[PDB]
Structure 1
Amino acid sequence: ADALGMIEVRGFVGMVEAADAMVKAAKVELIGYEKTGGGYVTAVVRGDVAAVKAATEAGQRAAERVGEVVAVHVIPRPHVNVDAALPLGRTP
């Protein structure tokens, strides 16, 4: 459905600064966060494609000040099989 934006920070503090800057700089929805162990937490915003492209690069620039940003990626159309298996906050 809606587009998918992600910030992965080694550290919880650099993720919340990323998750705060993404919802302020666009009309996106912070659906949750994923703790994959080892100190890799991942903020997931999810809205329309022109805003999540502006949310993450306002969140990547804001999370490199305080944390260790591992990966940033924006998916314009996530396929419907991704939203049904992986937990991106739009599970049918």
Structure 2
Amino acid sequence: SQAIGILELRSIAAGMELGDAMLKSANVDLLVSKTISRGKFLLMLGGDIGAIQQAIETGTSQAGRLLVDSLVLANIHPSVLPAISGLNSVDKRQAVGIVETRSVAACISAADRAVKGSNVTLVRVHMARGIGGKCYMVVAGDVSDVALAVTVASSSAGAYGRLVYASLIPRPHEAMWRQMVEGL
């Protein structure tokens, strides 16, 4: 199915010459393109596995030694990709769970295995910064649906030692709701 591509650079200008260059390389779509402290830059792609590799190989080779890190992920549930570049609309307020990971590489793995393993709506996959720091996912649904989403995430991230904490809020406060599902 779909794929996630990531390209992290040490120069902000390069990430934009390499941002516009991967858009013309294949039919990939841009999800994240923001500066990271203190000087690094982040690019996140998605789409067909062919387009992604053809786009990530494109940027990596041109980046040369400006490239700080680049990864590509495959077999990603399509409902993960809009959780990266934005949110997903909640159907109705219900139970919530959050899984915090130690590296963004493990964060997408735990969500992919969480949507393909339950019925929750993956709300958003936000990162406090970078590609090696605190990243979290948010999921909502039944008290049971969320309960299964966390355990598969707590396993897929725990099996790689990149897990910080995972909690479940069955009755989330009206305030905390509009912060976990909407961010503010």
Report TM bin, short chain.
0.7 to 0.9
Q: Which structure has the higher relative contact order (CA within 8 Å, separation 6+)?
A: 1
Counterpart position of 1:89 = 85
* Paired residues of 1:29 and 1:46 also in contact (CA < 8 A): yes
Counterpart position of 1:2 = 2
3-state DSSP of counterpart to 1:42: strand
4+ residue stretches of structure 1 with deviation over 3 A? 78-81
Query: How many aligned positions are there?
Result: 87
- Give the CA RMSD over aligned residues: 2.5
Unaligned runs of 5+ in 1: none
* Paired residues of 1:17 and 1:62 also in contact (CA < 8 A): no
TM-score scaled to structure 1, two decimals?
0.77
TM-score scaled to structure 2, two decimals?
0.41
C-alpha distance after superposition, 1:25-81 (max 9, x if no partner): 1100112313331111111111111110111101111222xx611011111134689
Percent sequence identity is: 26
Unaligned runs of 5+ in 2: 89-184
* Paired residues of 2:2 and 2:77 also in contact (CA < 8 A): no
The residue type equivalent to 2:74 in the other structure is P
Counterpart position of 1:63 = 63
Which of the two has higher C-alpha Rg? Answer: 2
Between the aligned partners of 2:34 and 2:74, the Cα distance in structure 1 is 20
Matches within 5 A, 1:1-92: 2-64=2-64, 68-78=66-76, 83=80, 88-89=84-85, 91-92=87-88
